[PDB]
């Protein structure tokens, strides 16, 4: 499956300016568009080479859409103050994630339209795309309003229609980068510890996409329980890094193996401290 997602944030900073508004759009885990109210001339801007192909109308419409959402999020923030009886001196956050997961097929797998207030769940469109889940008494007020306005059906039409259609077009136009694989380049490092044993660290560098499995083995056993793992992290050029370490006795290096599994590899790698 593939995904198109829009991550939206509005943050009030009372006493140091108007609330900040941001949008960022992703295909899979790859960022392609952004809008930021703090920019000089706030406008939708490309964040990948493949989206630059879209003509000026695309940018004008997306800009006007973001500006409309911005005005609407600023009203939401003021409304949230009344619903929660908060003052106009505190800084508050409103987040929204909307988008669609489609199968290799192209049909919809999951639609998302969900809000959070100060980093807590506020309201979300249910998986059925018909009803809402309000998290508290304040969100119940919003739910009631939105059911009376027929919001759910309008939003289902975007998630089932435009979202799915545009994802399929983005996957085609950005085919080169989005649907590529790059294999991990791996190596093992070796560090003598003061306890008298050694750290073996298995690196995986420059791979795309982010999914990968790094494991250490001693004679075929998986050693999952005793392995240090960092989170997969962006190298800042579109590729990813990850490492897994183990502690092993000083003379038993050659008995441990690192295994790397990735879509870009013709065969999974097996490494050893050399």
């Amino acid at each position: 499956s593939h995904s198109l997602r829009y991550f939206v944030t509005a943050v009030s900073r009372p006493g140091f300016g108007e609330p900040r508004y941001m949008e960022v759009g992703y295909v899979d885990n790859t960022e392609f568009v952004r809008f930021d109210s703090d920019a000089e001339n706030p406008r939708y801007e490309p964040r990948a080479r493949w989206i630059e192909q879209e003509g000026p109308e695309y940018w004008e419409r997306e800009t006007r859409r973001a500006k409309g959402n911005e005005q609407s999020f600023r009203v939401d923030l003021r409304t949230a103050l009344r619903y929660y009886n908060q003052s106009a001196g505190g800084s508050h956050t409103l987040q929204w994630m909307a988008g669609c997961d489609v199968e290799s097929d192209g049909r919809l797998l999951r639609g998302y339209w969900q809000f959070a207030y100060d980093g807590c769940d506020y309201i979300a469109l249910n998986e059925d795309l018909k009803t809402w889940t309000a998290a508290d008494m304040a969100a119940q007020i919003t739910r009631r309003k939105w059911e009376q306005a027929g919001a759910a059906e309008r939003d289902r039409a975007y998630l089932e229609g435009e979202c799915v259609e545009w994802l399929r077009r983005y996957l085609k136009n950005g085919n080169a980068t989005l649907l590529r694989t790059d294999p991990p380049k791996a190596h093992v490092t070796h560090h003598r510890r003061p306890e008298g044993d050694v750290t073996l660290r298995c690196w995986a560098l420059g791979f795309y996409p982010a999914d990968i499995t790094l494991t250490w083995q001693l004679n075929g056993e998986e050693l999952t329980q005793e392995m240090e793992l960092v989170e997969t992290r962006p190298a800042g050029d579109g590729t990813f890094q990850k490492w897994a370490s183990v502690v092993v006795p000083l003379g038993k290096e050659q008995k441990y193996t690192c295994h790397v599994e990735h879509e870009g590899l013709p065969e999974p790698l097996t490494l050893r401290w050399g």
């Binding site: 829009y6 419409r61 859409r65 959402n69 609407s72 009203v75 929204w96």
Partner: peptide
């Protein structure tokens, strides 16, 4: 393309 939020709290 992204979604429009026509409905307020």
């Amino acid at each position: 393309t992204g979604a429009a939020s026509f409905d307020e709290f």
